């Protein structure tokens, strides 16, 4: 078990689909290896509430019950995002954005509904996902993505999402989650956002590095640097959706093993702040990226690659 080999460092997590927790083959692996679960899709805004007031709890209830049942705590993925979210939250179906008052009321009601239903099992939440702009942000352009949320409320909508989550479960750790988390320009922006949040008194406990890396990746030097930067502003860091894609050869196979091995070194050296490393999907078979891309430490048949033994046993 990976969770065991890293007992003294951080939890080892995985994001699951409906089958991953219903099939005894897949369940065996999940239960062996991981001590943290995220719903891959069952807890996002559109899946759980595609029309105002019309909830669909069925899929998430299964994964949560799986987690209650086997004594694993969940990361709640996510409360707010520009994708997989019902239009109704920010616009009126003519296609006109709502006012900041209605938008806020929608975000509040949704967050109360979901946080309240799973707070017994969920230990932390990705409260806002992917609000920072992608690189190249010229001097004086906005550092935030220009989503409908941002168009209605500016940066404030982020502060609110966090206030509402905190009021709904004051004991949950609250994370800002984003991708290209080790890129030099974007991490600076992610740092800057979280710094403004704290200076406004927003209750943010942590940063989530998605860690969708590749094999030319970002370099381990950039990761190390990025974890050091985020450490100067929060007490808590998670890798939330770790993946090392190739874009199989035995030299590629090699490249990707080295990469995993060296990454987990860096993480190990930062155990103090790193609480959890979660993998997106259990195996290459389930991977959002596909079997070709050969991400993740288990293969199309849910079997440990050699790279799994490299990361499991270290120093």
In short:
This protein is an alpha/beta fold and 315 residues long. Helix content is 39%, strand content 16%. Helix 5 (100-118) packs parallel to helix 7 (156-168) and helix 10 packs parallel to helix 11.
Structure description:
- The PDB classes it as hydrolase.
- The entry lists the keywords xylanase, GH10, TIM-barrel fold, hydrolase.
- The assembly is monomeric.
- A psychrophilic glycoside hydrolase family 10 endo-beta-1,4-xylanase.
- The protein is xylanase.
- The organism is Aegilops speltoides subsp. speltoides.
- With about 325 residues, this protein is α/β, with parallel strands linked by helices.
- The protein has one domain (about 1-315): TIM Barrel.
- About 40% of the residues lie in helices and about 15% in strands.
- The protein contains eleven helices and nine strands.
- The protein has helices at about 1-5, 25-35, 45-50, 60-70, 100-120, 150-155, 155-170, 185-200, 220-230, 250-270, 305-310; strands at about 10-15, 35-40, 75, 120-130, 175-180, 205-210, 210-215, 235-245, 275-280.
- Strands 1-2-3-4-5-6-8-9 form an eight-stranded parallel beta barrel, surrounded by four helices.
- Strand 7 (about 210-215), helix 9 (about 220-230) and strand 8 (about 235-245) form a beta-alpha-beta unit.
- Helix 5 runs parallel beside helix 7 (about 155-170).
- The protein is globular.
- The two termini are about 15 Å apart.
Question: Quick one: CATH class?
Answer: Alpha Beta
Number of helices: 11
Number of domains: 1
The arrangement of helices and strands along the chain is HEHEHHEHEHHEHEEHEHEH
Q: How much β-strand is present in the residues?
A: 15-25%
Spatial strand order of the main sheet = 1-2-3-4-5-6-8-9
Output the CATH homologous superfamily.
Glycosidases
PDB class: hydrolase
Keywords: xylanase, TIM-barrel fold, hydrolase
Assembly: monomeric
Entry title: A psychrophilic glycoside hydrolase family 10 endo-beta-1,4-xylanase
């Amino acid at each position: 078990g990976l969770k065991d080999a890293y007992k003294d460092y951080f939890k080892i997590g995985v994001a699951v689909n409906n089958r991953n927790v219903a099939d005894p083959d897949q369940i065996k692996v999940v239960l062996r290896e991981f001590n943290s679960i995220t719903a891959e899709n069952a807890m996002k805004p559109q899946p759980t509430e595609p029309k105002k007031g019309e909830f669909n709890w069925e899929d998430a209830d299964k994964i949560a019950d799986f987690c209650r049942a086997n004594g694993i705590k969940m990361r709640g993925h996510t409360l707010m995002w520009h994708s997989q979210i019902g239009s109704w939250m920010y616009q009126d179906e003519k296609g006109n954005l709502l006012s900041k008052e209605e938008f806020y009321a929608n975000m509040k009601h949704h967050i109360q509904a979901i946080v309240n239903r799973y707070k017994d099992v969920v230990y932390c939440w990705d409260v806002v996902n992917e609000a920072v702009a992608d690189s190249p942000v010229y001097p004086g352009r906005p550092e935030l993505r220009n989503s409908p949320m941002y168009q209605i409320a500016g940066e404030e909508f982020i502060y609110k999402a966090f206030e509402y989550a905190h009021e709904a479960d004051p004991d949950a750790l609250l994370f800002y989650n984003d991708y290209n988390d080790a890129e030099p320009a974007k991490s600076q922006r992610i740092y800057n956002l979280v710094k403004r949040m704290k200076d406004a008194g927003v209750p943010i406990d942590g940063i989530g590095m998605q860690a969708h890396y590749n094999v030319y990746g970002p370099t381990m030097k950039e990761v190390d640097d990025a974890i050091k930067l985020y450490s100067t502003v929060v007490d808590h860091i998670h890798l939330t959706e770790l993946d090392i894609r190739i874009n199989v050869s035995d030299w590629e196979r090699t490249l990707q093993q080295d990469q995993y091995v060296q990454l987990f070194k860096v993480l190990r050296k930062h155990k103090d702040v790193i609480d959890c490393v979660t993998f997106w999907n259990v195996s290459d078979k389930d991977s959002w990226l596909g079997v070709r891309n050969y991400p993740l430490l288990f293969d199309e048949n849910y079997k440990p690659k050699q790279a799994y033994n490299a990361v499991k046993n270290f120093d």
